[PDB]
Amino acid sequence: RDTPELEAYYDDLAKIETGALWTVANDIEPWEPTPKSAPVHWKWSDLRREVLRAIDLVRPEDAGRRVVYLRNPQRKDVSAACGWLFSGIQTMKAGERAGAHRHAASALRFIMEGSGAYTIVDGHKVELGANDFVLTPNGTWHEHGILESGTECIWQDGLDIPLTNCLEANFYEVHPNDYQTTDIPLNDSPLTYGGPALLPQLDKWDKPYSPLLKYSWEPTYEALLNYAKASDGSPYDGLILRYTNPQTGGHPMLTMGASMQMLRPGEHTKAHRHTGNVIYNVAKGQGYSIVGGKRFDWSEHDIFCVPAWTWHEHCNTQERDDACLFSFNDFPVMEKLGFWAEQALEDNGGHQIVA
Amino acid sequence: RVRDTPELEAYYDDLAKIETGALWTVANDIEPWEPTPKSAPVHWKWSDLRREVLRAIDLVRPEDAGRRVVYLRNPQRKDVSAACGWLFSGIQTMKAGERAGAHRHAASALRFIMEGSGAYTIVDGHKVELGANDFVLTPNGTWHEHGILESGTECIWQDGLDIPLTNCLEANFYEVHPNDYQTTDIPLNDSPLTYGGPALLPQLDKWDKPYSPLLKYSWEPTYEALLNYAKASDGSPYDGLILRYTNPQTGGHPMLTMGASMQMLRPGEHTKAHRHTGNVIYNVAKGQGYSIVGGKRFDWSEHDIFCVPAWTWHEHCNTQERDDACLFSFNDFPVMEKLGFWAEQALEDNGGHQIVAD
Amino acid sequence: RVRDTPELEAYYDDLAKIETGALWTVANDIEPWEPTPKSAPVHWKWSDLRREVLRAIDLVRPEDAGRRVVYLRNPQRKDVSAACGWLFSGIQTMKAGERAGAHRHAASALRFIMEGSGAYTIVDGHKVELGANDFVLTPNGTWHEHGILESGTECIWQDGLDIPLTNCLEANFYEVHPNDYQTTDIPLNDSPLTYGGPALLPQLDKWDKPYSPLLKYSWEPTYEALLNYAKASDGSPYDGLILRYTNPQTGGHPMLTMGASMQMLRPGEHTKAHRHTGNVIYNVAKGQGYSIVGGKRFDWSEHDIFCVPAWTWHEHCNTQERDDACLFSFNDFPVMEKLGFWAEQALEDNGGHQIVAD
Amino acid sequence: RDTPELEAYYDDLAKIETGALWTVANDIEPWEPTPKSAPVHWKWSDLRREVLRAIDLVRPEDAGRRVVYLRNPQRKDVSAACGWLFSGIQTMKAGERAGAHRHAASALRFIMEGSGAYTIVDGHKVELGANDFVLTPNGTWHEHGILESGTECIWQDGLDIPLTNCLEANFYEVHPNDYQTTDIPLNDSPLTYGGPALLPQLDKWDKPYSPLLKYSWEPTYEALLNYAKASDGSPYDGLILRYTNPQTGGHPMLTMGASMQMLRPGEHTKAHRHTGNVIYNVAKGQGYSIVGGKRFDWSEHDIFCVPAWTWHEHCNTQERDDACLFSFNDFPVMEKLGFWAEQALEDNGGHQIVA
Ligand SMILES: [Fe+2]
Ligand SMILES: [Fe+2]
Ligand SMILES: [Fe+2]
Ligand SMILES: [Fe+2]
Ligand SMILES: [Fe+2]
Ligand SMILES: [Fe+2]
Ligand SMILES: [Fe+2]
Ligand SMILES: [Fe+2]
């Protein structure tokens, strides 16, 4: 036990708002990181049913608000899905309309069902189909909706709200007159900045985020097929392409990156771990994944977590069909702050034991 | 007051079964309009600080000798042991003979000398010598050891670390040197002597690290730079004549996560109040005066330490009649700047001065 | 008229003895107010071009077989053999079987296919296949060889080189491959298939060259990109809908010295005239019309070549009623942009159209 | 000889402004560069005498204009000193004054004698002493003069006029009202941006050239002495420091770089060659240099050329005194356009044979 002299010294230190470093929990400087976030897998059958169920059970108040957010069991206090990333599933009918606002939190919206979905980002209107995603970067006036001719749409939102909050950098304001006014032609952004290695001769665009705000499923699929003709990709991800800011080559946003990967028929990757958090969405196909020993058998439009520094591998159970996983992450924040670390699994042939 | 329907409550429980929830059930948005400081402003008098740090020598056990450091503990940040925001700060003491072993960690560190002479650090083979008000960098993942040269005196210094940030972001690594100490034949002070020149770099620059090649930042030349700056400008209305330390190779910040500044307040100067999104820890390098942080007045003198939480009104004052005052600071800024979270705002009311809340 | 004093003339000769002169003796400042084009605008009809290039096959000796190329010679730039400014351009022909050896040089090159199918180039092991209106890069100091695949036809292509610039700046190097040809097992078209995706890069990018990882730029997807661009904009008043090719890894230009553009002119479009500091060489990828360069009218059609000297008024027109016209171009721009020499100016007079000087 | 068929073919090619590549001089693509510029050495005794001599022999017309430009024998047509660089020696008395103008050509002015010399660059006034140099970068309003209390001053001008001209990028205009109007404090630039690894917290300066426009001799000398305590420098240059843009770490200007080197007592460097042109000015000391086999015995304030791809080495003949060479160059244009190449001499111990 401590000496009456020591216990008097710690008490003296507290009086001046100080302490002894030998008195704290030994993992103030840990040998390696250990995630507080736990691996979770969300079944599309459950999500579609419970989100649509919300329409008839929601009050006149709390318009939306009406989101089924993915709560990590170990991340309940900050309502995050993985690490410092927020994710919610939401729905709207044709003609429905949410007012414009801006926040310091960056966001992306990945459509998983329906047609007619749109987003105005700083006057640039963008229409989205299944497996397309739109960017709404930090500080931009954005609003969402469904076109009048559209169907009922269901999408996933990914934000860095928890990161924005914990860093004490959060800001919010509603549009001074509810909705943005713009005469800029529809889909101007993807149509002008969406060409392969191609940019307007005069680039009047000087913002640190991507000028391309919509990333299309079809051309991305087409490009992965092309990548399949010339490379095997990585041992840990297969044919993996990351989305870019075409002005810089860097990530689409300052805090968030996104990727799309293709797994060949019967392919089973090796396992690795890294310092970022990753949230996967199954854009196409059927298979399973092992993350932290736990097995997740996934189908089209399922969602699953991979916490930081957690062993993870992927597998396509289809016999003659490729599988495509969309994913977004906090990679840019890792890379910019020099915290990016990666390590392969040496045990087995590079594969986790499933219990 | 009014409980919502059993239908809704069945739905909430159904959502919990698949590890989800209804967003309208939370409550609360912690005010998304503007940041809420999680740290409290705190002052640390050098009188108390120095006196309590020396006491640790005779009280520390056989073990805990390597951990013999008094850390600045923010009363609202005890859970993560931060001094302010996601920044760690500690006070150490070593004597003429003493030296420590070398380790490497993901966290970045600053070592600002407060008292003494002939302190030294080895960073990846680069040996640097330090005096009062000088500081060194021990950046991400670099081999670093501390000690005092034979000809030196008893030293007291302040450590600055982004430890809470690194743990928080789940990215901290640690390993001791396999040989306990580093073996280096590189000439002494090679870094500040090759990279410390005013707007000058070696013609063939072989440095390939994202952080500064200049690892020691010297008090004397910094002070002389501020005297010169004073001849041509009044600087910022909110800090006086304020220069930030830089990475001479890129012109950016010294380290990827922490920035550092030195500022000179003219005799009798009272600065204007402002807010910003970073967390800043101040060490008084020279002089005497006060500061008002979030309503609280901190009368400081040489080597006092105080911090300013994010989005908190702050202003600085030099009480002296003839002599200038200098405030060293290290901060959170590179993380706010790179992630696009930087914001600043001036106090409009009361002539740019806070109402002092006793 | 009036000779200056023998005292002055003794002084001038004294200055020459130490290899100097009096600045007031020159005369002339070549007009320092604005640039003077050193190149003349020139048109090259495909009819003549193709016809004269094929003739070279039977006329060339045993030697000179490797040099069998008709270069575009600017009449006011014969001394340095440039097509326009400091840019070289030539026309080559190869048949289904033929292939050349590999060499490496400091100059950068573009190879734009004008006629034929199944052309190929190896760049540092990267094998690419080319069709009409596609082009490849053979950047600074890279191992490159050209040829036609077995299944291909007779090909005619245009080479674009910064040879005059490199000689002018005294920096050109040359060496043949020690093994005559390159040995590569890398899968065909690996570069455009891994780097040709719309806003997509391999998660682990291992390319570490200052120039583009994407070496083949394809006509078909470029054309489809312009049709899409047309749905949302009218582009520039001076070029119509104009996209430049980029380095997908940095977002900058494809090579450190040469830029390249493709532009689509809507049916019946007459563009506005402008000046700029670069030199541009145009190849007609699709359609028919005319252009006015420095007063001269050039009625062009598919695969005609013309250049625009620096600081020369130029405008483009599409004569067709239903179909769009496309103009490929490669240019000097990266050198003007990086050295801070870029300047542009619009024609104010005559509704933005030049007076055509017959 | 050529066949009547061939000579008719070349004639046909000329009619359409074309030629045969096998008919041109073989060194269109040379194996390596060979400089047209020749090594030259200008003696300070000659320069001081002939420049001062110009005052009494110049007409009322041609005010200045009154410059003794260093003409390379092989570069007479473009009036360059080396490669594409212009250099002239000029003088002014106290109170003398040249009007403000701007040009696309970048320039630097290296003071070699006298006191009171000044330059206003875009409102920023800068005073210069011996061995100090001021930048007047592309497109900036600049004017020169000597303070009323100053002495007779002699300086060297270094410009990239020939480069600006050959690239067809030259522009010029006189100030709409002759002289710049500014209330910005004297020496504001060196005093605010001249600190070692130190910049103002808010940097309102967004120009691609250096915010530090004056580089001082004394602190640069002081820094070379410090560099001498910890390194041997390069085998080919000794203790060589290059001047920087302190906002970027890059070169002070877009087309021009500058360096200052210290040679230790009795030091004799090895020889190398590179793709840039370099013009040296002897800021302090006495010694010799070998460039292209030719020996140049230099003294304080001498000037000498080193053409591109020409072997060059340096030597301090002083027994117990360091020698300092100032130099400026076209290195940034080489580096930015990827034309930078360097090669050591292997013959001898790395030393040229003097004939
Ligand atoms: Fe939002
Ligand atoms: Fe992964
Ligand atoms: Fe440490
Ligand atoms: Fe502040
Ligand atoms: Fe070639
Ligand atoms: Fe043009
Ligand atoms: Fe000038
Ligand atoms: Fe050299």
TrEMBL record, chains A, D:
Entries under CDD domains matching the protein: cupin_GDO-like_C, cupin_GDO-like_N
Molecular function terms, GO-annotated: gentisate 1,2-dioxygenase activity; metal ion binding
Keywords, alphabetical: Dioxygenase, Metal-binding, Oxidoreductase, Plasmid
Listed InterPro entries: Cupin_2, GDO-like, RmlC-like_jellyroll, RmlC_Cupin_sf
Residue ranges occupied by any Cupin type-2 domain in the UniProt entry: 89-155, 260-323
Disulfide bonds: C82-C305
Annotated positions binding Fe(2+) 2: D237, H272, H274, H312
Record-listed E.C. numbers: 1.13.11.4
Cited Gene3D superfamilies: Jelly Rolls
Residues given in the record as Fe(2+) 1 binding sites: H101, H103, H142
The protein's name in its UniProt record: Gentisate 1,2-dioxygenase
Species of origin: Ruegeria pomeroyi (strain ATCC 700808 / DSM 15171 / DSS-3)
